[PDB]
Write a protein that binds this ligand. Structure first.
Ligand code: HEM
Ligand code: HEM
Ligand code: HEM
Ligand code: HEM
Lengths: 141, 146, 141, 146
């Protein structure tokens, strides 16, 4: 469960992401597809080449949903209800993959936000992404 | 795939008593009932809305037989799982887009089905050898993903 | 979340187990230690030989906790609170391990309950053990 | 270790720039803060109640250097990781009783640490080669478990 300090750490870190949310989301996706190729199975309709516009656009969408989660940290299951339904009943992504995207997002943040990525903040972001993941797979079966 | 001679014998002994057609159907059907997420790959199979619809679906039954038939053939080549499943690996990745995690889920469900059919005879040591076999088959089927 | 049918399924199945729980708990553990040897790292102080008394004694305790969970199926997080605390703060068992024991319990039940271990029941039990595992692991960080 | 020549080269070049003392300390420290369950093995190191405590703990810093030192030596043996880490695998299983899952956690933390230090230079392709190396190391450390 996220503690007050976690929520504080996440709001601050994400704040510094700011207008770079979109770029980071795209980078994290690219990192995932290269590092963990089995994740490409969920995107057979995507042009997966470097700098592709489908990855960019999708990177933006992920990034925005996360901004929304941060803004609704105290109430995630409600702010994310439609995305939860989408992942559970339509997309049906196996849960292991969420850990893979989460890690890649951390690596992206660690690469772009050196001063801000302290050990406590790293801890907080990891729990946060984990909660987002639990929410997104909570209606699976 | 480190299998000891006595594990290999154990696996082979038991498998000789298996009706692959029947066990194939049961294993595929249970996968789709217990892990409904796996139904995303079989929308052409018609009605999968309830357990009886899945278990008795003639298409699920026919596919189960095909899957377990390939699996049996793999048991005849335990020392070269990778070569044996290379073309199926590529097919599953490039044409069917199946996340290999599903191979691990099927393997475990197959183990429950074997236990269900054989009861006592599926002793802890026999199960341990089968766990190694299903992991190897899962790894061989994933090996060509890129 | 367990559905009404899931609850009925689990009560029926566990009822048939009855006064065998202990024995089935021990078998699940032996199965787990043999199939997934990394799990033994958590029991370096146990005699892990076949028929071991420590193994039997521990099987009973696991089985008793599951019976208590079945008896309080509508209030599992509270019925198992103490156990959740124990696993989180003292034992600190990695969550992947819970999946391995759950699988072995299912194998154990399948081997002893042929008429009851139908597809729908298999599904309900898997979901039930997964909920029990989430509770036991919910206070980890 | 199915590492590509361009991948072996990417690993080696970046590693030549690593301050092992700092990275070791930071990776082991981060493991203990991000995944507190891992503290179970390090009760005798002292106070690990807070991040500042863990990160400043001299025994954590020293143990990090040792761990990363052995990792370093493995990077010169990439064609035989299993052989290289066999004794260490035996010791992690028989004397220390460490669940090998922790090896994968340390791997990912290490990758986050490398990205944090190298920024731009830690590109997607470079990360990918490192993910293969870290899984490779984790697998070799777990190989002798029984
Ligand atoms: C924190 C984790 C994640 C979040 C916040 C997230 C969020 C989203 C969002 C916002 C969309 C777009 C929905 C729309 O168009 O309105 C989406 C779609 C999608 N996501 Fe997830 N996602 C996450 C993880 C994953 C993972 C791990 C996978 C599998 C590798 C995945 C696979 C997909 C796929 C295949 C689509 C449909 C893409 C398309 O057809 O355009 N997502 N997700
Ligand atoms: C033991 C592991 C498995 C083996 C040995 C296996 C084997 C096979 C074989 C022999 C075929 C027919 C290939 C062809 O049409 O040319 C096939 C097709 C297929 N497999 Fe696999 N399979 C396995 C697991 C799975 C899993 C777990 C899934 C998804 C949950 C899956 C999804 C599919 C799909 C969707 C097809 C094509 C169905 C169609 O004809 O429309 N397979 N498999
Ligand atoms: C189905 C989930 C599980 C349940 C319901 C369960 C239940 C219990 C119970 C009742 C105890 C005894 C606590 C006491 O003495 O009051 C216990 C202790 C223990 N459990 Fe868990 N357990 C589960 C899974 C696991 C797993 C996956 C592991 C690690 C592989 C584990 C490792 C331990 C250990 C090491 C002890 C201490 C044993 C001793 O020192 O005597 N448990 N558990
Ligand atoms: C990259 C993976 C790892 C490597 C290469 C590594 C390497 C080493 C080495 C070289 C030693 C010194 C052994 C000796 O004195 O002969 C050691 C000790 C130890 N390692 Fe690992 N280690 C790794 C990961 C882990 C992790 C993840 C854990 C637990 C979270 C762990 C727990 C320990 C413990 C408890 C000791 C003994 C320390 C003491 O003297 O108190 N190791 N390790």
């Amino acid at each position: 469960v996220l503690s007050p300090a976690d929520k504080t750490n996440v709001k601050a870190a994400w704040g510094k992401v700011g207008a770079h949310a979109g770029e980071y989301g795209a980078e994290a996706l690219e990192r995932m597809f290269l590092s963990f190729p089995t994740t490409k199975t969920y995107f057979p309709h995507f042009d997966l080449s470097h700098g592709s516009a489908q990855v960019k656009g999708h990177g933006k969408k992920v990034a925005d949903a996360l901004t929304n989660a941060v803004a609704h940290v105290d109430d995630m299951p409600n702010a994310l209800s439609a995305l939860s339904d989408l992942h559970a009943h339509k997309l049906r992504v196996d849960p292991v993959n969420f850990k893979l995207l989460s890690h890649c997002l951390l690596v992206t943040l660690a690469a772009h936000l050196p001063a801000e990525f302290t050990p406590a903040v790293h801890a907080s972001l990891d729990k946060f992404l984990a909660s987002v993941s639990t929410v997104l797979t909570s209606k699976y079966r | 795939m480190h299998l000891t001679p006595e594990e290999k014998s154990a696996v082979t002994a038991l498998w000789g008593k298996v009706n692959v057609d029947e066990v194939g159907g049961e294993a595929l059907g249970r996968l789709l009932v217990v892990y409904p997420g796996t139904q995303r790959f079989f929308e052409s199979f018609g009605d999968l809305s309830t357990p009886d619809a899945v278990m008795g679906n003639p298409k699920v039954k026919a596919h189960g037989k095909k899957v377990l038939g390939a699996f049996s053939d793999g048991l005849a080549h335990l020392d070269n799982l990778k070569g044996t499943f290379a073309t199926l690996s590529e097919l599953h990745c490039d044409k069917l887009h199946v996340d290999p995690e599903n191979f691990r889920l099927l393997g475990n469900v197959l183990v429950c089905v074997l236990a269900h059919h054989f009861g006592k005879e599926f002793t802890p040591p026999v199960q341990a050898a089968y766990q190694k076999v299903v992991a190897g088959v899962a790894n061989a089927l994933a090996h060509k993903y890129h």
